[PDB]
Symmetry: none
Subunit: 114 residues, 2 copies
Amino acid sequence: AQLSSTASVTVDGKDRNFHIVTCRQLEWRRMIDIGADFSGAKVAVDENAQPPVVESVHIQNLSGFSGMYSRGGSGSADMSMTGDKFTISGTADGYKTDKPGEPATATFKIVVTC
Amino acid sequence: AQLSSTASVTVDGKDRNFHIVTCRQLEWRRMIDIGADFSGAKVAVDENAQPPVVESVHIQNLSGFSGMYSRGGSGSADMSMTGDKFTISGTADGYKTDKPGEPATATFKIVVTC
Ligand code: NA
């Protein structure tokens, strides 16, 4: 997540590294897409808020977890910048791939450089 | 959604009826929680958009399916309002709980009144 267009995503202590990262500016949000639709993470950031605010986090089939966070809903997501590097950390409700019929709330940390 | 605080959720043709519905608003965003965390659906709508758009849907252990939709990418959703009644249609990616580990897409219809 130090090299450009790379990311690491940790979910309940399990990591995935990505070389596939695309950031877009869909006003007024910065959209960070890590991985693929099938397996990856999508983060929407409001960069014009001070401090910047995470509007949503969708983790899909990543480290055995899928989860969904929306600002105003259950869970949380906080962000910080280290130079170009975003860190987005929080909790998200969803389900573990092993047990899709049971609820899971996982702690996540996304480190990503566009 | 015939009467207030009710919902019907159909996933790949299999319907569940709910009398447990909670709705919340954070500025532009309307959040609709149907059922329970163990078996239910959570919807985030952006009402600032004209017309309103579905931001995300998290279906949990409902009609034998758990899965996610978020705006962007291959999976999509559409919605309309008729008076107090929301109708939301789309696809979600997740798992049929009969077959854990086998990625599955499902067509959903949510009709809900807060
Ligand atoms: Na999508």
